Amino acid sequence: SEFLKASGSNFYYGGQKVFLSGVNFAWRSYGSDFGNGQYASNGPALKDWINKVKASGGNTARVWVHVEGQVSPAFDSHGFVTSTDSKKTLINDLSDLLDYANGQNVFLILVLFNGALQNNSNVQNLFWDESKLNSYINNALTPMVNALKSKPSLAAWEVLNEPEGTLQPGSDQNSCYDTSTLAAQGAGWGGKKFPMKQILKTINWISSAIHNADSKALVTVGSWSELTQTDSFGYRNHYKDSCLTGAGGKSNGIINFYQMHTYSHSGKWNQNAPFKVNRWAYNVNDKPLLIGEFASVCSQNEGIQNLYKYAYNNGYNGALTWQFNSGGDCSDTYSNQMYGMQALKGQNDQSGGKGGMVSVNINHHHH
């Protein structure tokens, strides 16, 4: 069966370039959607939400899993992972959602942990303790990967969301680790916990083990801003192969596609933010680039649909609104998030530089 691949600048499914059009859920219940039998409550709403996506001609949902350790993964008193969740429900809960999504021709991006906020000590120590990280890997992650890797609906795994949130900025000879410009750009807002080195080592080890278990699996990391995923404009791409691989020494611990998130401040984009610019401008054409989050309501009033269209026409490999449950700062309405996806209902253009296939026919699970 066919899965979503990433090759050069593009996503491919079934031989053809594809653009990821859709939304972030990103949860129904924050960190308690899956595990500890919590999916029986949460699942019907997010199945509905996945229905709302196929209906609107969208093809992707980004949805959060461990988050801040609220339910997953399960830790013993010494801070070692015993399992997926104490009721050992997570893998089936995800399995269910992935099977449903498939039926609606929607791809899922599963995001493992939050880095924007990460108020849980046991997770925090995964960044520092090599043995405790391996407990995560061995007792939760590898088993999650092995059960879910035959599921074509699973487009990609995201290790960590907005790592810059809990980043500890500071200098370092090696420029993969130097983040001395970021503090005044506002990183560290979740508290300054981790140096880039630990961040990158942590995500390196984690990717490595996903790839170990599922060779064709797609891994990403969603930065809070353009600032940290391009070498252009005097910025730094902190997540290029060289950097990750040199942090944790695991050679296949890479991301397969980049991902920026983007929001205006007081109605004004950053200078070289994605809707200001080209994907090509980011000089990052080795890998696909996804606009992982954005919202009409923190934009420059271009209007959701022109936003969807801008991303498709200016080289990006997908665009995902924030967020369907409609809650929090800079979140669109689930409704005009649907309006937005309609802007790309028909599309398939294989022309270089234009976006590709949107409505995808996702094959089933085979055994």
Side-chain angles (χ1 to χ4, degrees), residues 72-172 174-267 269-346 348-349:
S72 250
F75 290 94
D76 68 36
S77 40
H78 319 299
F80 283 75
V81 159
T82 64
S83 42
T84 234
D85 66 290
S86 42
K87 271 82 185 276
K88 286 182 212 233
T89 269
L90 186 104
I91 297 178
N92 304 322
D93 287 353
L94 296 162
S95 213
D96 192 81
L97 190 58
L98 286 162
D99 291 358
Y100 184 87
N102 187 117
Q104 303 300 143
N105 290 319
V106 171
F107 280 119
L108 287 200
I109 292 164
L110 295 193
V111 31
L112 258 31
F113 301 98
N114 201 191
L117 267 29
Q118 187 53 67
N119 293 121
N120 176 343
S121 294
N122 281 323
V123 182
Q124 288 167 23
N125 295 141
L126 266 28
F127 288 90
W128 300 97
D129 196 313
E130 301 198 355
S131 59
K132 290 177 178 178
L133 187 39
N134 285 302
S135 53
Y136 170 66
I137 289 162
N138 296 340
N139 290 332
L141 183 71
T142 300
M144 285 183 258
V145 187
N146 276 308
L148 303 178
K149 65 167 186 203
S150 52
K151 252 127 183 146
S153 223
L154 185 45
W157 308 73
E158 180 171 341
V159 186
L160 184 65
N161 165 82
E162 307 199 344
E164 302 80 35
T166 44
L167 187 223
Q168 181 181 70
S171 342
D172 188 273
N174 182 169
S175 74
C176 297
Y177 312 144
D178 184 286
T179 60
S180 44
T181 64
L182 308 190
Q185 305 287 18
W189 75 89
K192 283 145 152 193
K193 312 185 187 289
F194 317 114
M196 196 77 230
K197 178 165 194 187
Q198 300 306 300
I199 291 175
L200 294 173
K201 185 215 204 175
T202 299
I203 143 265
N204 181 232
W205 284 39
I206 293 167
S207 179
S208 175
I210 300 172
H211 293 304
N212 287 149
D214 176 21
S215 56
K216 56 61 172 161
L218 290 190
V219 185
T220 195
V221 169
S223 282
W224 116 108
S225 191
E226 69 273 358
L227 274 8
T228 199
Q229 275 189 36
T230 189
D231 287 306
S232 296
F233 308 108
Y235 309 153
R236 180 74 46 236
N237 181 357
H238 281 91
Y239 307 87
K240 45 196 189 270
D241 292 28
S242 84
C243 288
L244 289 183
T245 246
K250 298 220 196 260
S251 83
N252 74 339
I254 61 166
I255 54 182
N256 302 112
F257 73 82
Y258 300 109
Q259 195 200 135
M260 300 160 179
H261 299 166
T262 197
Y263 300 97
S264 62
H265 295 93
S266 303
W269 294 120
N270 294 352
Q271 246 306 290
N272 310 306
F275 291 107
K276 274 287 206 72
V277 102
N278 258 359
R279 93 149 275 186
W280 310 111
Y282 294 118
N283 189 198
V284 93
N285 313 349
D286 39 313
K287 301 180 193 295
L289 174 61
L290 197 221
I291 308 176
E293 309 172 5
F294 77 94
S296 324
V297 81
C298 301
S299 57
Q300 273 181 13
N301 259 81
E302 295 93 331
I304 6 160
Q305 291 198 332
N306 306 314
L307 259 12
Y308 271 99
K309 263 180 290 200
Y310 183 107
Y312 186 97
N313 288 146
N314 290 110
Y316 300 89
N317 300 279
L320 264 37
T321 50
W322 183 274
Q323 70 188 142
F324 222 60
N325 72 33
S326 293
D329 305 329
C330 287
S331 173
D332 286 313
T333 270
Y334 76 72
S335 256
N336 98 125
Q337 285 180 83
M338 289 190 266
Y339 187 40
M341 280 170 289
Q342 277 165 39
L344 304 166
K345 225 168 202 291
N348 175 16
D349 190 318

